[PDB]
Amino acid sequence: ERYENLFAQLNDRREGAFVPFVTLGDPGIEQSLKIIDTLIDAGADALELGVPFSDPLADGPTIQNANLRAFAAGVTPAQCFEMLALIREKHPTIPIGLLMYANLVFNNGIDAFYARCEQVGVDSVLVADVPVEESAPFRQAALRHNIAPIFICPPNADDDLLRQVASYGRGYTYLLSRSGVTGAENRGALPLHHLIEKLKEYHAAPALQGFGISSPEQVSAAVRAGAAGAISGSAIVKIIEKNLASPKQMLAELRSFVSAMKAASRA
Amino acid sequence: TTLLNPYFGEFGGMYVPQILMPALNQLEEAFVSAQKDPEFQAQFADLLKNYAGRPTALTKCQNITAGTRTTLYLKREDLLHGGAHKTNQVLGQALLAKRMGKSEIIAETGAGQHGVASALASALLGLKCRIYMGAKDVERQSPNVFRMRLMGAEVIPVHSGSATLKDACNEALRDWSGSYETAHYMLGTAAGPHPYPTIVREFQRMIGEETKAQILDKEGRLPDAVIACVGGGSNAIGMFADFINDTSVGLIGVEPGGHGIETGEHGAPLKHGRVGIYFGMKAPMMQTADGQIEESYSISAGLDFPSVGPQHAYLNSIGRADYVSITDDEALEAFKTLCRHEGIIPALESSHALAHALKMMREQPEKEQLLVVNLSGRGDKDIFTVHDILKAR
Ligand SMILES: O=P(O)(O)OCCNS(=O)(=O)c1ccc(OC(F)(F)F)cc1
Ligand SMILES: C=C(/N=C/c1c(COP(=O)(O)O)cnc(C)c1O)C(=O)O
Ligand SMILES: c1ccc2[nH]cnc2c1
Ligand SMILES: c1ccc2[nH]cnc2c1
Ligand SMILES: [Cs+]
Ligand SMILES: [Cs+]
């Protein structure tokens, strides 16, 4: 219900959402926590948070490297859940979404995974390598534990897929900007207006555009096109990567960037 | 919705990002169409016979079984053009790529035999080929890198992770997720998302069909067992498929034991891993307690992968096939034995299958048994590796 409340508030203020992604525990647990506090203070409307995985097949080099940094700091899924408890304790209302790979959810039990999510106060889970066709046990477990299962609407989505995503998903619909893997340098396209309008027709959860969104201009364009907001990952992670040696400058640059991206969502 | 069953019992499926589902459905539809198309079948048969050199020999090896009651035949996929069984299904998938109007091929390779097969088929049929290969494999299977490049393929070293086959697979799939409109992903084993385990089986099954006909000709009966190494599963399922319904025929798959199962440095997930989801499939995996995918190890680059095709996981679960492991040292001994006593230099991958057959014979030398080992490839690519080991000894 944290998403429902957020989108209602943004609608009332005629604003779009800006949603940063980072990898949990990159470049360490303590610095990660401070990074996330900075994203929120700078105006993030929600968070997408990655649990480090050995083989992230939807991610390009920037986020691959974030995963590696987290592993070098010895980050495990259990520590991620510890971090999530701390974030939720400080920030009661912000929607928190996890970006998961299937094996980490399926490992020792789908139901148990979503139960841990509910216990810690996560709001949604996007399992990147589970298409709607394989989704049944994941989405069922999610709903039983009051977690929103997030589904992807790709650019070339047919009508059958639009109907399934609208029916099965909750929280938000992930509107994929382009084919390929995550990455800031590969920009992608404007929200296909036809997809945005079809999802609305079918009463889908509000659409957030993601992949290759790296500039305020692209955030504005997403909202103007009728999306409820935008997600940016690689652009944020690049600021981490660039500033590993100066954690103070890291936070200042993250604050400035997130501030600007959020401003663009008010356009 | 699919046309064919994506699962083998619990195992298999299509665990890819949503973006790729249309590509997999298009490939499935093209395969189903092609399987009914006499012109496609005739083209494929013609390439297999007149270009690749099928049917391959079945060789009786009667020096290495002297003094025992074992009769051993070798199915000679090492004699296929390119030097391994990989050539068979690449010719079929290349024709499917053309059928679908694709101009480009992406492939992964470990031993470099799938890479060479992909490159040669692309040269013949007019496709642009790019091949991902782990940087450790670029070094240990270097003859194949030279062959791929001479045939005009782009070979891309992958330095990530273990810098071996898993890492090459990862990069190939990431590429395809952005390039599928113009590129076909020529997956080189009976694993990954549906429909690949099914396509690869159906385009390798001539191995077992020929074996059956040849052994009936020579021996007047079926083998007691057929034995094949398992990297992802293609040469083994190609050998097994035509015998699955012949209930008397044992089906034995050989996983790499590496430095020994007890060391954790192996590639034997069927027997020593745990079901997981990775590389588009639900299958046995080498994984940590927390569900991270582990790095595999084998002396053989072609077996060095931490998972296995779902049809093998299924055949194991129901007890129709048995799976065993062979260590690096065992494989090396079988390599040396075949070179010196039969005058055939086998791939180190295939040497794992031979090593298990030699153990079946030596452990029970008065047991009457008629065995076939799939000699999946030739060992030219491995001679520098093997030389350097025997020298260090
Ligand atoms: O800004 P970028 O280009 O780094 O993209 C940010 C993406 N981060 S995320 O967690 O939304 C995200 C969402 C979906 C992903 O894969 C899937 F689409 F297949 F499901 C991967 C990452
Ligand atoms: C990984 C590769 N080869 C595997 C291989 C294998 C193992 O792969 P399959 O389990 O798919 O047969 C067996 N025999 C030979 C000669 C091989 O080259 C490759 O060539 O890329
Ligand atoms: C799922 C299961 C079995 C099937 N047989 C044909 N299509 C199928 C899909
Ligand atoms: C295992 C995994 C991937 C492969 N590609 C070609 N042969 C393989 C074996
Ligand atoms: Cs004999
Ligand atoms: Cs293996």
Side-chain angles (χ1 to χ4, degrees), chain B residues 161-331:
Chain B
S162 33
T164 61
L165 179 52
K166 149 181 98 58
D167 316 285
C169 287
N170 289 350
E171 292 294 15
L173 198 53
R174 290 183 175 116
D175 185 337
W176 196 41
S177 75
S179 65
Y180 66 83
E181 288 195 354
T182 58
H184 173 63
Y185 178 34
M186 193 144 65
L187 214 164
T189 192
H194 179 75
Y196 287 103
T198 295
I199 294 175
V200 174
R201 177 192 71 231
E202 289 301 301
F203 286 173
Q204 287 292 0
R205 69 176 296 126
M206 65 281 296
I207 300 174
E209 282 167 359
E210 289 174 13
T211 297
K212 180 183 288 185
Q214 290 167 314
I215 200 77
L216 281 170
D217 178 56
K218 291 308 174 190
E219 291 290 335
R221 62 179 172 113
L222 297 168
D224 293 312
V226 300
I227 305 142
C229 70
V230 180
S234 68
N235 88 93
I237 205 72
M239 175 61 83
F240 292 174
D242 204 53
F243 294 104
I244 288 172
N245 291 168
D246 300 297
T247 57
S248 74
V249 177
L251 309 178
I252 305 170
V254 184
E255 305 192 279
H259 296 308
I261 302 300
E262 70 281 353
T263 68
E265 300 183 343
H266 63 80
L270 259 174
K271 295 312 288 309
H272 302 286
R274 184 151 67 74
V275 68
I277 298 166
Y278 161 70
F279 191 55
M281 52 176 185
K282 181 177 291 184
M285 309 277 170
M286 300 176 63
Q287 53 177 309
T288 71
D290 285 355
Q292 308 295 353
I293 312 303
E294 288 188 337
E295 291 175 5
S296 54
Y297 167 75
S298 177
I299 190 178
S300 160
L303 303 184
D304 196 344
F305 182 67
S307 189
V308 62
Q311 194 167 3
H312 289 291
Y314 176 67
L315 290 172
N316 181 57
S317 72
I318 67 173
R320 177 64 192 98
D322 292 326
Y323 299 84
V324 300
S325 65
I326 285 289
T327 66
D328 288 358
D329 281 349
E330 293 172 307

Side-chain angles (χ1 to χ4, degrees), chain A residues 42-93:
Chain A
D45 292 303
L47 304 171
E48 201 65 34
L49 302 173
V51 172
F53 183 57
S54 63
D55 301 85
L57 288 188
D59 282 303
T62 298
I63 294 171
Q64 282 169 42
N65 291 329
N67 285 261
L68 289 176
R69 287 192 297 272
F71 282 125
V75 178
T76 64
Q79 291 183 310
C80 288
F81 278 108
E82 287 161 32
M83 290 185 64
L84 290 166
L86 292 170
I87 297 159
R88 177 58 76 214
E89 183 183 26
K90 279 179 297 190
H91 307 283
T93 65

Side-chain angles (χ1 to χ4, degrees), chain B residues 85-86 109-114 165 189 229 231-235 302 349 376-377:
Chain B
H85 72 289
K86 296 296 189 178
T109 199
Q113 291 298 140
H114 181 66
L165 179 52
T189 192
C229 70
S234 68
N235 88 93
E349 291 75 20
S376 58

Side-chain angles (χ1 to χ4, degrees), chain B residues 68-71:
Chain B
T68 77
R69 294 201 71 198
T70 292
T71 299

